[PDB]
Design a protein around this ligand. Sequence first.
Ligand SMILES: OC[C@H]1O[C@H](F)[C@H](O)[C@@H](O)[C@@H]1O
Ligand SMILES: [Zn+2]
Length: 472
Amino acid sequence: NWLGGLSRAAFPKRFVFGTVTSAYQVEGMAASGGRGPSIWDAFAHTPGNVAGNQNGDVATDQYHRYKEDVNLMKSLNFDAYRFSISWSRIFPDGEGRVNQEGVAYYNNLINYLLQKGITPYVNLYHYDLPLALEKKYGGWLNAKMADLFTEYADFCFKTFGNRVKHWFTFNEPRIVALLGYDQGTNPPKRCTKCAAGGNSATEPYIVAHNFLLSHAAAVARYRTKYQAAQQGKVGIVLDFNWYEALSNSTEDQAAAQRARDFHIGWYLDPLINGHYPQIMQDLVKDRLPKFTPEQARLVKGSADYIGINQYTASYMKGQQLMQQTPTSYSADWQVTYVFAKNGKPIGPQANSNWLYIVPWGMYGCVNYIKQKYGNPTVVITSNGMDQPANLSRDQYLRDTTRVHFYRSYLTQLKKAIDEGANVAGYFAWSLLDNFEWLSGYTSKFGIVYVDFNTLERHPKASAYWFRDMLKH
Ligand SMILES: OC[C@H]1O[C@H](F)[C@H](O)[C@@H](O)[C@@H]1O
Ligand SMILES: [Zn+2]
């Protein structure tokens, strides 16, 4: 049967199912309703930066249509909705003056979700630093971000926290560090060779440290000022793609483990254990910032749950560890990516070239976190796959590959949960086709099709799959 034995009965009691978007990717009204620009507004308006020179000015226009989209998610039997608050929609300059019109939007959205029985899971940050903070402070290179972020978070807790009980601070700080400061392909476009300046060997580590310190500061403020009255929770969202040793050799197994540590351990070892991974300390040395004992104690235990964004898996091949002049966070891992084993690719690709369909990577990642980090509460905060540009409406709707994707990946998640993994929820990326960053509107991740000419929504087969699987 097309559900493949899946239903709410196949998951733990009270397990949360939801869909996910982010502010810049779906809201539109980017320069309206009082919103100030983010670093993504500037980046996307520069010719050549995004496919088709497209941008999020209008996006899906969820800003005007949010009640349609909430009605849709309820009709599809979801329990929850993960979305983000745009920092610059609340504080156009990132600090100081509050944009009351922006505040009213999120109040209206939160209130409608609750009216319709959908639980809001709210991200404070999703790639969209206010441009004013980038220019005035240097963004995530500046340790002052901890204070700036805490003040923003404090405002959101005070204003929405009587209703919002499930918060996340950040989304994928690894990708900000990697693409923003190592490879220089996302804003602020910093890297050793880059026109904007930078240093691919140092800046990614500075940025990660500042995200951890900022997360910890915001959580400390929540716990000391707001938690007694509000009785909510705050976590963080981290990307994790699986790494599998190419062979059982000592060096291939070590390579795969080095990649896990440089990928997820970079954040989880501080958040769970209060220190960076030993291998990162060993290889990165004085380029890796040191937490003071006090900072380490603030960071440790500061996530009430761990959001994992999970998509794909890679084979890893090793090498003898070498003394090397530092060049980048990427080169620091000393690993070799391989995309086939025994003459077979690890999986077929979706539309995005990085996205190999490997359902067992979901099991890999979840099992790994369970066994290594004392089985922390995990929420799968994004998982999904994309269709290419230029299909007909009917072709978008008949998304049989995405149906197969969710069935297989959720079957693997079920396997990990049935073995004891403490997973509390699962969220599909995305509710809607939307603005896919460098790919603009050429990549379609939604379970609901969005016609970008007319802005009409049409549920795809995968939406109806969820509706059938999730019926109460
Ligand atoms: O690449 C697909 C998707 O991956 C992650 F979930 C990011 O948080 C999203 O912003 C992005 O659109
Ligand atoms: Zn509109």
